[PDB]
């Protein structure tokens, strides 16, 4: 056990050792890429999974096969005789939270705030987008007012999810065969603009919902309430737009896949005993080993990406990459304040009366609560070892970390420092705050809801398998089983989804080993403390709610992005 | 990294970090047992299995998912409603090879020598167990002839497999929810004894065969209650030959799979790791041929021989009765260790290469895993031989090893493995012995797993053939057969999909392959030996495809190609 210290306060002896270590760790730690993403030449046999992990993974899988055995869903491409089918899909299995009230237009609202992807609803200002015609008349037989879109917005009450990233999308294609000769069919896409308002006990509710970009009054008209089935079939492809940015965006991108070049930077250039790696490899443990596992299962040809997703494997990839290069060259404007106050959801963004505009917002308090205990946590923990900006600068293994993350090879993070160097303490506690924010809350936050809201697949289908009926056309239930995914899709998105949500890898605060610094087993216990206290808060917050929010729930955010 | 030396012939400093390598090295492979079985306390996350291997699992795992989507099996405890419905398990696997033609009695027979379990056939010498009260009416009815058992037996014709060692179980309980009330049910236990016949005729072609002669399901004979079955009893001798299966699946699995490979090989990978430096020759020698072994060793501590795990809802016996026969199979091993090499093996039941007739033909010339087997222990004997000879010249060097010492030590001591047949005198003391220990070690990791794992899919997935347990008792003999008999007796829906995720999950890959570890030798010599061996591998995979091109049916299972490197899945 070696007590952790800057390169600069060792002794010549100590700082070569240091160097042969950091040598060593880059032999064993080589930079790679797939398809344009950063990853690991070869994954050290220290950072593979551990027997424990290995033992619950095979549970689930096994689990997997049991409830399949008891299914009555078969390996054919043809949809669901009926809809309630999709309900007998879970005979060994937890029923997902979302099945039995996903129809409830505030259940499909709520799930922009708490639901697996709680990131893109955004505060209207000034105007709607000019391609997203919603009317005065519109909305006045809506929401059964005399008020107007204008006075609306000027009052902050309405809110939108603007899918248009997935506007460029090449639709997936799949294939099987059937009676001798190969089948090929396409997948439709849709990148849909969805209007809410807050209305106010208070609910935040669906309004309007246009499927594609581009308007037109017959071929691509704005669905309301007001307009039955045709409503229902609106939101399955909106569920389906904000599925496909929920995996391409915000969980393998902006979790998985930009936590790595941080796990490899580390690798490279801190040494074992190095305080930064110290404080941030308990928030590495198997990252890089489920970042391969992603390559390999998931963003993989015949994966489930490729199988699931709305777009081809390519079309996928390139929205991942995409979200990665803007979260990369605007680092600092993802930490969790600013990213709300951009999308207008921040705790500052409130009335007249100092009440927030969107006042239900479970991720937002939630993590906003995990994301101060941790900042408090790498204050103190770097405060044991930083306490003058020259100790910063003089941090030749530091400067070396900084260096490799903004460098086009390790990882390309532009936006990660000002004026081109690392000087200050407390802009490398806003990264480490980060980073470890994003392996614990944010990957918890976005991962473990896949189950209760993506496993009943009507509610959040991964892609839609038939175009939107015209308005006038009669909607029969053989409609929307043709427009959900068939039998074997389905299938394959209840595994991945059971997959990714069977158990913990392991809990944010309490790591494997204990510091050796005794003062830093302090600073962690204190941590801890605080965890105890949010959990505490968050439960008396639950039996307020209208609906629990029980995904940041300090006992259940791992310590890393693991699963 | 570092030359492989003889700790006697290091400096005091070099000894000194060989002494500091063994002390971590004991603090991270400690000791431990579940249930009377010698295991690791916690695996070494270097011992843990790597990522291709958890990628190829879990790709097998996944087919399993799929394969069972498109199957019609549900998850039950009713009988299937047909007999044909065992060959509609597989829409999206590999069909057992068994499956066309496991009802033909030459195909039962020739498991003896070439299935799962080629260990148990002994040719018999002087009579038939008294127990077994075979006439020689039955016989020659049977064989069609006028020969005597007196007379096949003083020319070495007959052979018997005898299941007593299953005698004593006590049968697995299960139960479930049928209509809102708890059912609970029983197993059926069966200790039988086949008598089968060497024909040199065989079937008018000029080639020779095990045929089957006689079945008794249990040890102690009854003309109502256990009697003896012939081909001549139809339908009741094809469940005869089901509840002869079920036997020689559980002691497989119980015997000759966990306990007789996996087993008994863990106290040799800790005592390699509690007692050898990294540095030491027979470390850099064994090593390879124990990668991810403890690792699945967890594994069937964990999901086989656990608490609702595959033996105890597969198996014939309770959990605790296949426990037992467990620890009595390693115990048995352990205490003659030198007495289950494999030339020794086989002649202790009287199927060794040296039992030859006087014509100088083998009694039993049919016999692939012998054969190949053989071929395979020659080779790896070669391979240690010339090994180490390259660091032991002289037996002294043997006794001056302070570190072999005390890995013989360790392993013979009761909390180290037990292994009481491993020396003479209590100690270490030839080059030639250690040979013969390293071989028998590097034969067992590698080809005889091989030669009891690979089988399990192409003989024990299609449930008919080789079903894990018998779910009603044998039916009288004058009684009329049904096909809902048969389906009784077989495993019902839930567990004969629970026996096939099993089978192939133990067949899905190969973690590594015989002879080709992950690193070089350091050692340019031990490289030299090393290549040499793989030479000789490869003129033995073609030997072995020649004769597969001469035999009835071809043998694959030890073919080098298909032979691990070690232990692993
Ligand atoms: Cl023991
Ligand atoms: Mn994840
Ligand atoms: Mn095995």
Known sequence: MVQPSLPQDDTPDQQEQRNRAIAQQREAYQYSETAGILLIKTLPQSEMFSLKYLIERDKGLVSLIANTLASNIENIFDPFDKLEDFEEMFPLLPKPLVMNTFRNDRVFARQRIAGPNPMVIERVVDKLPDNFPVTDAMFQKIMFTKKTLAEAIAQGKLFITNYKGLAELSPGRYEYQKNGTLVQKTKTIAAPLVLYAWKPRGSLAPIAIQINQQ???????????RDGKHWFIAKIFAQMADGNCHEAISHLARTHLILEPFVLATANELAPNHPLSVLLKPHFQFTLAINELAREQLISAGGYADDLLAGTLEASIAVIKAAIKEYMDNFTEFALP??????????????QRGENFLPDYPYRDDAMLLWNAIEVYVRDYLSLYYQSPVQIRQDTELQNWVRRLVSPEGG????LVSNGELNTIEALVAIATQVIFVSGPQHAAVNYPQYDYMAFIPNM??????????KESNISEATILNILPPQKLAARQLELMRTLCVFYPNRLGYPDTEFVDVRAQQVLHQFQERLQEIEQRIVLCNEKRLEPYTYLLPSNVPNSTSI
């Open 215 to 225: 308007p037109d009054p017959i071929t691509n008209p704005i669905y309301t309430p």
């Open 338 to 351: 600013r990213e709300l106050a951009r999308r207008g959801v921040g705790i500052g963004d409130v009335d």
């Open 412 to 415: 390309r993070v532009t936006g």
């Open 461 to 470: 289908p991964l892609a839609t398998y038939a175009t939107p009926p015209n």
